[PDB]
CSV table of C-alpha atoms and ligand atoms in Angstrom, one decimal:
chain,number,residue,atom,x,y,z
A,180,UNK,CA,-38.2,-13.1,10.5
A,181,UNK,CA,-35.9,-11.7,7.7
A,182,UNK,CA,-32.5,-13.1,9.0
A,183,UNK,CA,-31.9,-16.8,8.4
A,184,UNK,CA,-28.9,-19.1,9.3
A,185,UNK,CA,-30.6,-22.3,8.0
A,186,UNK,CA,-31.7,-22.9,4.3
A,187,UNK,CA,-34.4,-25.4,5.4
A,188,UNK,CA,-36.0,-22.8,7.7
A,189,UNK,CA,-35.6,-20.1,5.0
A,190,UNK,CA,-37.4,-22.3,2.5
A,191,UNK,CA,-40.4,-22.8,4.9
A,192,UNK,CA,-40.9,-19.0,4.8
A,193,UNK,CA,-39.7,-17.7,1.4
A,194,UNK,CA,-40.6,-14.1,0.2
A,195,UNK,CA,-39.5,-13.1,3.8
A,196,UNK,CA,-35.8,-14.1,3.6
A,197,UNK,CA,-33.6,-10.9,3.2
A,198,UNK,CA,-30.3,-12.2,4.6
A,199,UNK,CA,-29.2,-15.8,4.5
A,200,UNK,CA,-26.0,-16.5,6.5
A,201,UNK,CA,-24.6,-20.0,5.8
A,202,UNK,CA,-20.9,-19.2,6.6
A,203,UNK,CA,-18.7,-21.8,8.3
A,204,UNK,CA,-21.4,-24.6,8.1
A,205,UNK,CA,-19.3,-27.2,6.1
A,206,UNK,CA,-21.6,-26.6,3.1
A,207,UNK,CA,-20.5,-28.9,0.2
A,208,UNK,CA,-23.3,-28.0,-2.2
A,209,UNK,CA,-25.8,-25.2,-2.5
A,210,UNK,CA,-29.3,-26.6,-3.3
A,211,UNK,CA,-31.0,-25.4,-6.5
A,212,UNK,CA,-34.0,-24.3,-4.3
A,213,UNK,CA,-31.9,-21.1,-3.5
A,214,UNK,CA,-33.6,-19.5,-6.5
A,215,UNK,CA,-37.0,-19.5,-4.6
A,216,UNK,CA,-35.7,-16.8,-2.2
A,217,UNK,CA,-36.9,-14.0,-4.5
A,218,UNK,CA,-36.4,-11.2,-1.9
A,219,UNK,CA,-32.8,-12.3,-0.8
A,220,UNK,CA,-30.5,-9.2,-0.6
A,221,UNK,CA,-27.4,-10.8,1.0
A,222,UNK,CA,-26.2,-14.3,0.7
A,223,UNK,CA,-23.2,-15.3,2.9
A,224,UNK,CA,-21.5,-18.6,1.8
A,225,UNK,CA,-18.0,-17.8,3.2
A,226,UNK,CA,-15.8,-20.4,4.7
A,227,UNK,CA,-17.5,-23.6,3.2
A,228,UNK,CA,-16.5,-26.4,0.9
A,229,UNK,CA,-18.4,-25.4,-2.3
A,230,UNK,CA,-16.8,-26.6,-5.6
A,231,UNK,CA,-19.5,-25.1,-7.9
A,232,UNK,CA,-22.8,-23.1,-7.8
A,233,UNK,CA,-26.3,-24.2,-9.1
A,234,UNK,CA,-27.6,-22.4,-12.3
A,235,UNK,CA,-30.6,-21.3,-10.2
A,236,UNK,CA,-28.4,-18.7,-8.4
A,237,UNK,CA,-29.2,-16.5,-11.4
A,238,UNK,CA,-32.9,-16.2,-10.2
A,239,UNK,CA,-31.9,-14.0,-7.2
A,240,UNK,CA,-32.9,-10.8,-8.9
A,241,UNK,CA,-32.9,-8.8,-5.6
A,242,UNK,CA,-29.4,-10.0,-4.5
A,243,UNK,CA,-27.0,-7.1,-3.8
A,244,UNK,CA,-24.2,-9.0,-2.1
A,245,UNK,CA,-22.8,-12.4,-2.7
A,246,UNK,CA,-20.1,-13.6,-0.3
A,247,UNK,CA,-18.4,-16.7,-1.6
A,248,UNK,CA,-14.9,-16.4,-0.1
A,249,UNK,CA,-12.8,-19.3,1.3
A,250,UNK,CA,-14.5,-22.1,-0.6
A,251,UNK,CA,-13.0,-24.4,-3.3
A,252,UNK,CA,-15.0,-22.9,-6.3
A,253,UNK,CA,-13.6,-24.3,-9.6
A,254,UNK,CA,-15.9,-22.3,-11.9
A,255,UNK,CA,-18.7,-19.7,-11.9
A,256,UNK,CA,-22.0,-20.6,-13.9
A,257,UNK,CA,-22.8,-18.4,-17.0
A,258,UNK,CA,-26.1,-17.5,-15.0
A,259,UNK,CA,-24.0,-15.4,-12.6
A,260,UNK,CA,-24.5,-12.6,-15.2
A,261,UNK,CA,-28.3,-12.6,-14.4
A,262,UNK,CA,-27.7,-11.0,-11.0
A,263,UNK,CA,-28.7,-7.5,-12.2
A,264,UNK,CA,-28.8,-5.9,-8.7
A,265,UNK,CA,-25.5,-7.4,-7.5
A,266,UNK,CA,-23.2,-4.6,-6.2
A,267,UNK,CA,-20.6,-6.7,-4.4
A,268,UNK,CA,-19.1,-10.0,-5.5
A,269,UNK,CA,-16.6,-11.6,-3.0
A,270,UNK,CA,-14.7,-14.6,-4.3
A,271,UNK,CA,-11.4,-14.4,-2.6
A,272,UNK,CA,-9.6,-17.7,-1.7
A,273,UNK,CA,-11.1,-20.1,-4.3
A,274,UNK,CA,-9.7,-22.1,-7.3
A,275,UNK,CA,-11.1,-20.1,-10.2
A,276,UNK,CA,-9.0,-20.4,-13.4
A,277,UNK,CA,-11.5,-18.3,-15.5
A,278,UNK,CA,-14.3,-15.8,-15.2
A,279,UNK,CA,-17.3,-16.1,-17.6
A,280,UNK,CA,-17.8,-13.4,-20.2
A,281,UNK,CA,-21.3,-12.9,-18.7
A,282,UNK,CA,-19.5,-11.0,-15.8
A,283,UNK,CA,-19.8,-8.0,-18.2
A,284,UNK,CA,-23.6,-8.1,-17.7
A,285,UNK,CA,-23.2,-7.3,-13.9
A,286,UNK,CA,-23.8,-3.5,-14.7
A,287,UNK,CA,-24.5,-2.7,-11.0
A,288,UNK,CA,-21.2,-4.3,-9.7
A,289,UNK,CA,-19.2,-1.8,-7.6
A,290,UNK,CA,-16.8,-4.3,-5.9
A,291,UNK,CA,-15.3,-7.5,-7.3
A,292,UNK,CA,-12.9,-9.4,-5.2
A,293,UNK,CA,-11.1,-12.1,-7.1
A,294,UNK,CA,-8.0,-12.2,-4.9
A,295,UNK,CA,-6.4,-15.6,-4.0
A,296,UNK,CA,-7.5,-17.6,-7.1
A,297,UNK,CA,-5.7,-19.2,-10.1
A,298,UNK,CA,-6.6,-16.6,-12.7
A,299,UNK,CA,-4.2,-15.8,-15.6
A,300,UNK,CA,-6.7,-13.9,-17.8
A,301,UNK,CA,-9.9,-11.9,-17.7
A,302,UNK,CA,-12.6,-11.7,-20.5
A,303,UNK,CA,-12.4,-8.4,-22.5
A,304,UNK,CA,-16.2,-8.0,-21.4
A,305,UNK,CA,-14.7,-6.7,-18.0
A,306,UNK,CA,-14.6,-3.3,-19.9
A,307,UNK,CA,-18.4,-3.1,-19.6
A,308,UNK,CA,-18.2,-2.8,-15.7
A,309,UNK,CA,-18.6,1.0,-15.8
A,310,UNK,CA,-19.9,1.2,-12.2
A,311,UNK,CA,-16.9,-0.9,-10.8
A,312,UNK,CA,-15.1,1.1,-8.1
A,313,UNK,CA,-13.0,-1.7,-6.5
A,314,UNK,CA,-11.2,-4.6,-8.2
A,315,UNK,CA,-9.0,-7.0,-6.3
A,316,UNK,CA,-6.9,-9.4,-8.4
A,317,UNK,CA,-4.0,-10.0,-6.0
A,318,UNK,CA,-2.5,-13.5,-5.4
A,319,UNK,CA,-3.4,-14.9,-8.9
A,320,UNK,CA,-1.3,-16.0,-11.9
A,321,UNK,CA,-1.3,-12.9,-14.1
A,322,UNK,CA,1.9,-12.6,-16.2
A,323,UNK,CA,0.3,-9.6,-17.8
A,324,UNK,CA,-2.9,-7.7,-17.3
A,325,UNK,CA,-5.2,-7.0,-20.3
A,326,UNK,CA,-5.3,-3.4,-21.6
A,327,UNK,CA,-9.2,-3.4,-21.2
A,328,UNK,CA,-8.5,-2.8,-17.5
A,329,UNK,CA,-7.7,0.9,-18.4
A,330,UNK,CA,-11.3,1.3,-19.7
A,331,UNK,CA,-12.8,1.1,-16.1
A,332,UNK,CA,-13.6,4.9,-15.9
A,333,UNK,CA,-15.1,4.7,-12.4
A,334,UNK,CA,-12.3,2.5,-10.8
A,335,UNK,CA,-10.9,3.8,-7.6
A,336,UNK,CA,-8.9,0.9,-6.2
A,337,UNK,CA,-7.0,-1.8,-8.2
A,338,UNK,CA,-5.2,-4.6,-6.4
A,339,UNK,CA,-2.7,-6.5,-8.6
A,340,UNK,CA,-0.2,-7.5,-5.8
A,341,UNK,CA,1.5,-10.9,-5.8
A,342,UNK,CA,1.1,-11.7,-9.4
A,343,UNK,CA,3.9,-12.3,-12.0
A,344,UNK,CA,3.7,-8.9,-13.8
A,345,UNK,CA,6.9,-7.7,-15.5
A,346,UNK,CA,5.3,-4.7,-17.2
A,347,UNK,CA,2.1,-2.6,-17.0
A,348,UNK,CA,0.0,-1.9,-20.2
A,349,UNK,CA,0.3,1.8,-21.3
A,350,UNK,CA,-3.6,2.0,-21.1
A,351,UNK,CA,-3.4,1.8,-17.3
A,352,UNK,CA,-2.9,5.6,-17.5
A,353,UNK,CA,-6.5,6.0,-18.6
A,354,UNK,CA,-7.8,5.2,-15.0
A,355,UNK,CA,-8.5,8.9,-14.3
A,356,UNK,CA,-10.5,8.2,-11.1
A,357,UNK,CA,-7.9,5.7,-9.6
A,358,UNK,CA,-7.0,6.5,-6.0
A,359,UNK,CA,-5.2,3.3,-4.9
A,360,UNK,CA,-2.9,1.1,-7.0
A,361,UNK,CA,-1.5,-2.1,-5.4
A,362,UNK,CA,1.4,-3.6,-7.3
A,363,UNK,CA,3.5,-5.1,-4.4
A,364,UNK,CA,5.5,-8.3,-5.0
A,365,UNK,CA,5.3,-8.6,-8.8
A,366,UNK,CA,8.5,-8.5,-10.9
A,367,UNK,CA,8.0,-5.0,-12.4
A,368,UNK,CA,11.3,-3.9,-14.0
A,369,UNK,CA,9.9,-0.6,-15.4
A,370,UNK,CA,6.8,1.6,-15.0
A,371,UNK,CA,5.1,3.0,-18.1
A,372,UNK,CA,5.5,6.8,-18.8
A,373,UNK,CA,1.6,6.8,-18.8
A,374,UNK,CA,1.7,6.2,-14.9
A,375,UNK,CA,1.8,10.1,-14.7
A,376,UNK,CA,-1.7,10.3,-16.2
A,377,UNK,CA,-3.2,8.9,-12.9
A,378,UNK,CA,-4.2,12.4,-11.7
A,379,UNK,CA,-6.4,11.1,-8.8
A,380,UNK,CA,-3.8,8.6,-7.5
A,381,UNK,CA,-3.2,9.0,-3.7
A,382,UNK,CA,-1.5,5.6,-2.8
A,383,UNK,CA,1.0,3.7,-5.0
A,384,UNK,CA,2.2,0.3,-3.5
A,385,UNK,CA,5.3,-0.9,-5.5
A,386,UNK,CA,7.2,-2.8,-2.7
A,387,UNK,CA,9.2,-5.8,-3.6
A,388,UNK,CA,9.5,-5.4,-7.4
A,389,UNK,CA,12.6,-5.0,-9.6
A,390,UNK,CA,12.5,-1.3,-10.5
A,391,UNK,CA,15.9,0.3,-11.3
A,392,UNK,CA,14.6,3.8,-12.2
A,393,UNK,CA,11.3,5.8,-12.0
A,394,UNK,CA,10.0,7.6,-15.1
A,395,UNK,CA,10.2,11.4,-15.1
A,396,UNK,CA,6.4,11.4,-15.5
A,397,UNK,CA,6.1,10.1,-11.8
A,398,UNK,CA,6.2,13.8,-10.9
A,399,UNK,CA,2.9,14.4,-12.6
A,400,UNK,CA,1.1,12.5,-9.8
A,401,UNK,CA,-0.3,15.7,-8.2
A,402,UNK,CA,-2.6,13.9,-5.7
A,403,UNK,CA,-0.1,11.3,-4.5
A,404,UNK,CA,0.2,11.0,-0.7
A,405,UNK,CA,2.0,7.7,-0.2
A,406,UNK,CA,4.7,6.2,-2.4
A,407,UNK,CA,6.0,2.8,-1.2
A,408,UNK,CA,9.1,1.7,-3.1
A,409,UNK,CA,10.7,-0.7,-0.5
A,410,UNK,CA,12.8,-3.5,-1.8
A,411,UNK,CA,13.4,-2.5,-5.4
A,412,UNK,CA,16.8,-1.8,-7.2
A,413,UNK,CA,16.6,2.0,-7.5
A,414,UNK,CA,20.0,3.6,-8.1
A,415,UNK,CA,18.6,7.2,-8.6
A,416,UNK,CA,15.4,9.2,-8.2
A,417,UNK,CA,14.3,11.6,-11.1
A,418,UNK,CA,14.5,15.3,-10.3
A,419,UNK,CA,10.7,15.4,-11.1
A,420,UNK,CA,10.0,13.6,-7.8
A,421,UNK,CA,10.1,17.2,-6.3
A,422,UNK,CA,6.8,18.0,-8.1
A,423,UNK,CA,4.8,15.7,-5.7
A,424,UNK,CA,3.5,18.6,-3.5
A,425,UNK,CA,0.9,16.3,-1.7
A,426,UNK,CA,3.4,13.5,-0.9
A,427,UNK,CA,3.4,12.7,2.9
A,428,UNK,CA,5.2,9.3,2.9
A,429,UNK,CA,8.2,8.3,0.8
A,430,UNK,CA,9.4,4.7,1.7
A,431,UNK,CA,12.6,3.7,-0.1
A,432,UNK,CA,13.9,1.0,2.4
A,433,UNK,CA,16.3,-1.4,0.8
A,434,UNK,CA,17.1,0.2,-2.5
A,435,UNK,CA,20.6,1.0,-3.9
A,436,UNK,CA,20.4,4.9,-3.8
A,437,UNK,CA,23.7,6.7,-3.6
A,438,UNK,CA,22.5,10.3,-3.8
A,439,UNK,CA,19.2,12.2,-3.6
A,440,UNK,CA,18.2,14.9,-6.2
A,441,UNK,CA,18.4,18.5,-4.8
A,442,UNK,CA,14.7,18.8,-5.9
A,443,UNK,CA,13.8,16.5,-2.8
A,444,UNK,CA,13.6,19.8,-0.9
A,445,UNK,CA,10.4,20.7,-2.9
A,446,UNK,CA,8.4,18.0,-1.0
A,447,UNK,CA,6.3,20.5,0.9
A,448,UNK,CA,4.1,18.0,2.7
A,449,UNK,CA,6.5,15.2,3.3
A,450,UNK,CA,6.3,13.8,6.9
A,451,UNK,CA,8.1,10.5,6.6
A,452,UNK,CA,11.2,9.7,4.6
A,453,UNK,CA,12.6,6.2,4.9
A,454,UNK,CA,16.0,5.7,3.3
A,455,UNK,CA,17.1,2.7,5.5
A,456,UNK,CA,19.3,0.2,3.8
A,457,UNK,CA,20.5,2.4,0.9
A,458,UNK,CA,24.1,3.3,0.0
A,459,UNK,CA,23.9,7.1,0.5
A,460,UNK,CA,27.3,8.9,0.7
A,461,UNK,CA,25.9,12.4,1.2
A,462,UNK,CA,22.5,14.3,1.8
A,463,UNK,CA,21.7,17.5,-0.3
A,464,UNK,CA,21.6,20.8,1.6
A,465,UNK,CA,17.9,21.0,0.3
A,466,UNK,CA,17.0,18.3,2.9
A,467,UNK,CA,16.5,21.3,5.3
A,468,UNK,CA,13.5,22.6,3.2
A,469,UNK,CA,11.4,19.6,4.4
A,470,UNK,CA,9.5,21.7,7.0
A,471,UNK,CA,6.8,19.1,7.7
A,472,UNK,CA,9.2,16.2,8.1
A,473,UNK,CA,8.6,14.2,11.3
A,474,UNK,CA,10.5,11.0,10.7
A,475,UNK,CA,13.8,10.5,8.9
A,476,UNK,CA,15.3,6.9,8.7
A,477,UNK,CA,18.9,6.7,7.4
A,478,UNK,CA,20.0,3.5,8.9
A,479,UNK,CA,22.8,1.5,7.2
A,480,UNK,CA,23.7,4.1,4.7
A,481,UNK,CA,27.3,5.2,4.2
A,482,UNK,CA,27.0,8.8,5.4
A,483,UNK,CA,30.2,10.4,6.7
A,484,UNK,CA,28.6,13.8,7.5
A,485,UNK,CA,25.2,15.6,7.6
A,486,UNK,CA,24.6,19.0,6.0
A,487,UNK,CA,24.3,21.9,8.5
A,488,UNK,CA,20.8,22.4,7.0
A,489,UNK,CA,19.6,19.2,8.9
A,490,UNK,CA,19.0,21.7,11.8
A,491,UNK,CA,16.2,23.4,9.7
A,492,UNK,CA,13.9,20.3,10.2
A,493,UNK,CA,11.8,22.0,12.9
A,494,UNK,CA,9.1,19.3,13.0
A,495,UNK,CA,11.5,16.3,13.1
A,496,UNK,CA,10.6,14.0,16.0
A,497,UNK,CA,12.6,10.9,15.0
A,498,UNK,CA,16.1,10.6,13.4
A,499,UNK,CA,17.7,7.3,12.7
A,500,UNK,CA,21.4,7.3,11.8
A,501,UNK,CA,22.4,3.9,12.9
A,502,UNK,CA,25.3,2.1,11.3
A,503,UNK,CA,26.5,4.9,9.0
A,504,UNK,CA,30.1,6.2,9.3
A,505,UNK,CA,29.5,9.6,10.9
A,506,UNK,CA,32.6,11.3,12.2
A,507,UNK,CA,30.8,14.3,13.7
A,508,UNK,CA,27.3,15.8,14.1
A,509,UNK,CA,26.7,19.4,13.0
A,510,UNK,CA,26.2,22.0,15.9
A,511,UNK,CA,22.9,22.8,14.2
A,512,UNK,CA,21.5,19.5,15.6
A,513,UNK,CA,20.6,21.6,18.6
A,514,UNK,CA,17.9,23.5,16.6
A,515,UNK,CA,15.8,20.2,16.4
A,516,UNK,CA,13.5,21.3,19.3
A,517,UNK,CA,10.8,18.6,18.5
A,518,UNK,CA,13.3,15.7,18.4
A,519,UNK,CA,12.3,12.8,20.7
A,520,UNK,CA,14.4,9.9,19.4
A,521,UNK,CA,18.0,10.1,18.0
A,522,UNK,CA,19.7,6.9,17.1
A,523,UNK,CA,23.5,7.2,16.6
A,524,UNK,CA,24.4,3.6,17.2
A,525,UNK,CA,27.4,2.1,15.2
A,526,UNK,CA,29.0,5.4,14.0
A,527,UNK,CA,32.5,6.9,14.6
A,528,UNK,CA,31.5,9.8,16.8
A,529,UNK,CA,34.5,10.7,19.0
A,530,UNK,CA,32.7,13.9,20.3
A,531,UNK,CA,29.1,15.5,20.4
A,532,UNK,CA,28.5,19.2,19.9
A,533,UNK,CA,27.8,21.1,23.2
A,534,UNK,CA,24.5,22.3,21.4
A,535,UNK,CA,23.0,18.8,22.1
A,536,UNK,CA,22.1,20.2,25.6
A,537,UNK,CA,19.5,22.3,23.7
A,538,UNK,CA,17.5,19.1,22.9
A,539,UNK,CA,15.1,19.5,25.9
A,540,UNK,CA,12.4,17.2,24.4
A,541,UNK,CA,14.9,14.3,23.6
A,542,UNK,CA,13.6,11.1,25.3
A,543,UNK,CA,15.9,8.5,23.9
A,544,UNK,CA,19.5,8.8,22.7
A,545,UNK,CA,21.3,5.7,21.4
A,546,UNK,CA,25.1,5.9,21.4
A,547,UNK,CA,26.4,2.3,21.6
A,548,UNK,CA,29.4,1.4,19.4
A,549,UNK,CA,30.8,5.0,19.1
A,550,UNK,CA,34.4,5.9,20.4
A,551,UNK,CA,32.9,8.4,22.9
A,552,UNK,CA,34.8,9.0,26.2
A,553,UNK,CA,32.8,7.9,29.3
A,554,UNK,CA,33.4,11.3,31.1
A,555,UNK,CA,31.7,13.2,28.2
A,556,UNK,CA,28.6,11.0,28.2
A,557,UNK,CA,28.4,11.2,32.1
A,558,UNK,CA,28.3,15.0,31.6
A,559,UNK,CA,25.7,14.8,28.8
A,560,UNK,CA,23.5,12.7,31.1
A,561,UNK,CA,23.4,15.7,33.6
A,562,UNK,CA,22.7,18.2,30.7
A,563,UNK,CA,19.7,16.1,29.5
A,564,UNK,CA,18.1,14.7,32.7
A,565,UNK,CA,14.8,13.9,31.0
A,566,UNK,CA,16.7,11.8,28.3
A,567,UNK,CA,17.4,8.1,28.6
A,568,UNK,CA,21.0,7.7,27.1
A,569,UNK,CA,21.8,4.2,26.0
A,570,UNK,CA,25.7,3.9,26.2
B,667,CA,CA1,-13.1,6.7,-2.8
B,668,ZN,ZN1,-1.0,-2.8,-1.3
B,669,ZN,ZN1,4.9,-10.3,-0.8
B,670,ZN,ZN1,17.9,-0.7,9.3
B,671,ZN,ZN1,28.7,-3.3,11.1
B,672,ZN,ZN1,26.6,-4.4,21.8
């Protein structure tokens, strides 16, 4: 027997215990005799009522994973640094206000989850975690993040969402292996120019911040695939945004954009462009160069017209133009052979181009709240028999 769910049973046969699972057992205290389980590799203490840990936890020299999530931990003992084989430390949902400097001794640590605690600082000794690949600090009380974070050469994922960050340290740009950066729901008013140094960054979550502009250096993110900028205060995009050749998803929902740079057409790999809730008055002709675009959301903008180049979007499957002020659709709309959904609700369309009959793959057409004559729509229903027309 190597798997145990009971500490009393585990203590009768020590040197055999490899996994000790005590999750959801209303455990109020971990007995000091835990140190006797010399061959323990995984200790699961999740979903319990632990307020502290015994100093003897440091004796678990073979421990590779320590799961301590969803407890009421007020502090970690200095002896936590003695866990020289520890690769994963999970402490999400606790009441930690500090992390001991001895955390820097955990030279084998690959993953550290400190999300949902009450941390405002980290010891500078965090810079010694040169094997750390994943660091979660979301839902804490960081008003600022120490520049020593930028020293984590092997870091691939950094979670800093739901903190109180106004600014990022310029040293963040030294995370050359970073692939995912989570900054949702902070109060970021600006991004450092050094953000562009994150050459391996694939995913950047910046939703629900207070950004007004993006630095020109944002274009240096050569590996970026997903850029989530929902619910910020962007009034413009830098022309350098067009240098993001690997970008697949650009989410700009609920910003204050009035125009798009012509360089938007350079986004070779863009599949999804969400501009819902902006204040666009026009689209550049360059929009037609987005040959991989599948989804285009333009709801609640102020568009009066669409460029004829919209018809060049050969891979477009979904087009949302709800609640704009469109007076007409270009005849080129008929070239959208892959289009399946077209939402034209709440516009001022008094007519539709005859070329709409060429949309053989259209499945759903939303026309409610347009001054369209009923005879014209009845005729379109017979021209697109496979389409459901909501009018
Ligand atoms: Ca990876
Ligand atoms: Zn995120
Ligand atoms: Zn949030
Ligand atoms: Zn909308
Ligand atoms: Zn309205
Ligand atoms: Zn209605």
